[PDB]
Amino acid sequence: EDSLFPARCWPDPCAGITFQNDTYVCGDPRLGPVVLPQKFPLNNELRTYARFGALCPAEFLDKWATDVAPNGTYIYPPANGFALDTEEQPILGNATLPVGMKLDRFGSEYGTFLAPLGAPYIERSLPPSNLNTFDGMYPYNYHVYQVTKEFVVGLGPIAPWFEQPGMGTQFVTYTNVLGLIDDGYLRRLDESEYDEKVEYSNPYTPGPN
Amino acid sequence: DSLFPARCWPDPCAGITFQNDTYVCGDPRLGPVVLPQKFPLNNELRTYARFGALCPAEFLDKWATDVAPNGTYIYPPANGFALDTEEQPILGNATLPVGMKLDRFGSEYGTFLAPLGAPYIERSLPPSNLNTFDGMYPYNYHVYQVTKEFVVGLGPIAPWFEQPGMGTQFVTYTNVLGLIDDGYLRRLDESEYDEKVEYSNPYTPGPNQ
Ligand SMILES: *[C@@H]1O[C@H](CO[C@@H]2O[C@@H](C)[C@@H](O)[C@@H](O)[C@@H]2O)[C@@H](O[C@@H]2O[C@H](CO)[C@@H](O[C@@H]3O[C@H](CO[C@H]4O[C@H](CO)[C@@H](O)[C@H](O)[C@@H]4O)[C@@H](O)[C@H](O[C@H]4O[C@H](CO)[C@@H](O)[C@H](O)[C@@H]4O)[C@@H]3O)[C@H](O)[C@H]2NC(C)=O)[C@H](O)[C@H]1NC(C)=O
Ligand SMILES: *[C@@H]1O[C@H](CO[C@@H]2O[C@@H](C)[C@@H](O)[C@@H](O)[C@@H]2O)[C@@H](O[C@@H]2O[C@H](CO)[C@@H](O)[C@H](O)[C@H]2NC(C)=O)[C@H](O)[C@H]1NC(C)=O
Ligand SMILES: Nc1ncnc2c1ncn2[C@@H]1O[C@H](COP(=O)(O)OP(=O)(O)OC[C@H]2O[C@H](O)[C@H](O)[C@@H]2O)[C@@H](O)[C@H]1O
Ligand SMILES: *[C@@H]1O[C@H](CO[C@@H]2O[C@@H](C)[C@@H](O)[C@@H](O)[C@@H]2O)[C@@H](O)[C@H](O)[C@H]1NC(C)=O
Ligand SMILES: *[C@@H]1O[C@H](CO[C@@H]2O[C@@H](C)[C@@H](O)[C@@H](O)[C@@H]2O)[C@@H](O)[C@H](O)[C@H]1NC(C)=O
Ligand SMILES: *[C@@H]1O[C@H](CO)[C@@H](O)[C@H](O)[C@H]1NC(C)=O
Ligand SMILES: *[C@@H]1O[C@H](CO)[C@@H](O)[C@H](O)[C@H]1NC(C)=O
Ligand SMILES: NC(=O)c1cccnc1
């Protein structure tokens, strides 16, 4: 029953979408790549991902971007995408990430938003275009890091957006990822460092005793 | 087996008194030998190494009051919410909207839920929350949908039990059974959470334009 487009969108699911480049769904980079990961661990993070929810491409862009036409840009949630409390204030706190913690991210290293290693794509409230590849060394723009020196981030729940439920945890950094790497706070992990279950467990948090 | 770190052989169950062969080392605190083979539970447990890199007795020594059968798991402070730099829990009161899907490992007399599909390692649960108590709910696993909006404590999950945590937890003010009896939640059949589209979000509105 799973498919690129909801069944309602056929026979012409790309109607209203201006074709630009055939790498992307309907030719539109905002709709993300046609090709998705078929191997662990990335396929595990995408197993619950219905890219448009129950919407069709033009409906999705009409809802979440300023225009269905190519000049339209995605609109992002207020308060940095933190889930809002009953007083419409973001839920978050400053928190120290411990040495050893593993983080990952879909996007360039000029960004400031990470998630705990292995968070489902739908928990991140990201649009489909964060899966576009810009560097062949990092398919799907997917990066994994490990904390090598303690540092403080804004930490809190992710608000739903982009037709997904959110409710992962996001870490919002004060320095971009590249600067954290170059300053010795993060190191990059290669696939052999995150392709076994034990690499997802936690050896750094001490026990109560 | 692969239940155990290779370093734990021979006698990976050293120090563990055998009780019942449903469970690892015969110990219900260590969870079931047989893990789920179907979506979504297999997706939720694909990154779960139940002992981390510890051997069974080491795991219980770290996280329970006793390796002997009478030892009980020790739980994190502040109801398991991640702590900020001032050592206060990060959380807020939040309204769960009609349509949101939630899940839970545990009986309906409890009060802790997660967004549908959260990886087991994001929940900072001990292995015994996977034990089956009712044949109608293999692995203790329950799925719900909000039918009337209500307020919960909402916040990030601290690491515990050798896992990274950092999902979002919802701590309810009434137990789950009362929420069902009062019309706030309904129970979902497996048919209602075995398709990718059923994990997407149709209830959150798009930005005002
Ligand atoms: C989230 O919302 C919570 C309330 O939400 C509602 O209620 C829940 C149960 C659901 O139904 C939900 O759907 C509703 O929306 C909110 O809970 C509130 O938390 C505060 C702070 O913890 C509580 O205040 C404390 O109250 C106790 C009890 O006071 C009564 O008895 C004492 C007897 O000593 C009398 O003196 C009072 O007049 C009351 O009759 C107080 O003992 C306590 O005082 C102590 O702490 C304060 C701190 O300010 C000091 O000033 C004092 O000197 C004491 O040291 C607090 O005043 C409040 O009762 C509680 N409300 C309810 C309805 O339970 C929670 O704080 C929200 N959380 C967040 C993160 O926003
Ligand atoms: C979280 O902390 C920031 C301040 O963090 C410091 O500055 C950052 C740039 C980063 O380097 C951190 O590691 C530092 O510890 C708070 O922002 C400050 O808030 C105070 C209070 O009003 C204000 O006077 C300062 O000007 C702010 N400083 C900056 C740089 O913005 C922020 O409010 C904290 N958030 C929470 C939720 O506690
Ligand atoms: N190598 C690249 N070359 C050119 N453009 C790129 C490249 N990589 C990404 N883009 C484009 O850069 C943009 C994404 O930047 P990014 O750093 O990757 O990922 P984000 O999710 O953190 O940034 C989105 C933020 O923007 C909102 O306001 C919120 O603050 C969001 O957090 C896309 O248009 C890409 O086409
Ligand atoms: C964005 O562009 C709109 C026109 O786009 C053009 O016309 C439509 C019918 C498609 O054929 C599309 O491929 C073309 O590029 C404008 O009407 C609209 O005002 C523009 N938005 C802004 C903010 O300038
Ligand atoms: C907890 O249990 C400890 C060991 O109990 C012994 O081993 C188990 C397997 C049973 O056979 C039991 O009958 C044995 O006595 C005790 O040493 C300890 O006192 C108990 N209580 C506490 C609080 O630790
Ligand atoms: C545009 O399409 C061409 C194929 O004609 C492809 O080689 C190129 O990489 C595409 N551009 C992007 C940014 O993907
Ligand atoms: C082990 O536990 C299961 C479930 O509680 C039960 O069905 C089974 O009978 C138990 N085995 C023994 C030998 O008690
Ligand atoms: N780019 C990401 O992977 C991301 C975005 C928002 C929150 N957490 C992680």
Q: In angstroms, what is the span from residue A46 Cα to ligand 8's centroid?
A: 14
- Dist CA B137 CA B132 (whole Å): 7
**Residue in the block written with tokens 């290779």:** B6
Beta strands in chain B (DSSP E): 92-96, 101-105, 112-115, 141-146, 150-156, 168-171, 185-187
For this PDB entry, the determination method is X-ray
The answer to whether position A207 is within a domain reads: no
* Catalytic status, residue A47: no
Alpha carbons B152 and A107: distance in angstroms, whole number: 32
Q: Is A39 exposed, middle or buried (0-12, 13-18, 19+ CB in 10 A)?
A: exposed
Residue B195's closest CA among A54, A57, A32? A54
- List, by residue number, the catalytic residues of B: 104, 169
Q: Round to whole Å and give the CA distance between B33 and B48.
A: 13
In a domain, A206, yes or no: no
Let me know if residue B209 belongs to a domain.
no
- A173 domain-assigned: yes
> How far, in Å, CA of A59 to CA of A16, rounded?
9
**Is residue A209 a part of any domain in this protein?**
no
Which ligand sits nearest to residue B19's alpha carbon? 7
Question: Does residue B170 fall inside a structural domain?
Answer: yes
CA distance A118 to A103: 8
Residue A205 lies in a domain: no
> Does A140 fall in a domain?
yes
Q: Rounded to whole angstroms, what are the CA distances from B85 to A152, B41, B50, B82, B114?
A: 8, 34, 29, 10, 24
Q: Give the structural domain span for A116.
A: 7-200
Integer Cα distance of B122 and B167 in angstroms = 4
Q: Measured between alpha carbons, how far is A156 from A89 in angstroms, rounded to an integer?
A: 12
Residues with CB under 6 A from ligand 4: A 18, 67, 69-71
Sheet hosting strand A151-157, strand order edge to edge: A93-97, A151-157, A169-172, A113-116, A102-106, A142-147, A186-188
Q: How far apart are the first and last CA of chain A?
A: 49
The angle formed by the CA atoms of residues A206, A41 and B29, to the nearest 5 degrees, is 40
For β-strands B141-146 and B92-96, DSSP reports them as: unpaired
The alpha-helical segments, DSSP class H, found in B31-101 are 41-44, 56-63
Spatial distance between the Cα atoms of A65 and A109, rounded to a whole number of angstroms: 24
Query: Is A61's C-beta closer than 6 angstroms to any atom of ligand 2?
Result: no
Tokens coding A55: 């919407």
Separation CA A208–CA A153 (nearest Å): 24
How many folded domains does chain A comprise? 1
How far apart, in whole angstroms, are the C-alpha atoms of residue A18 and residue A1?
27
C-alpha to C-alpha distance for B102 and B145, rounded to whole angstroms: 6
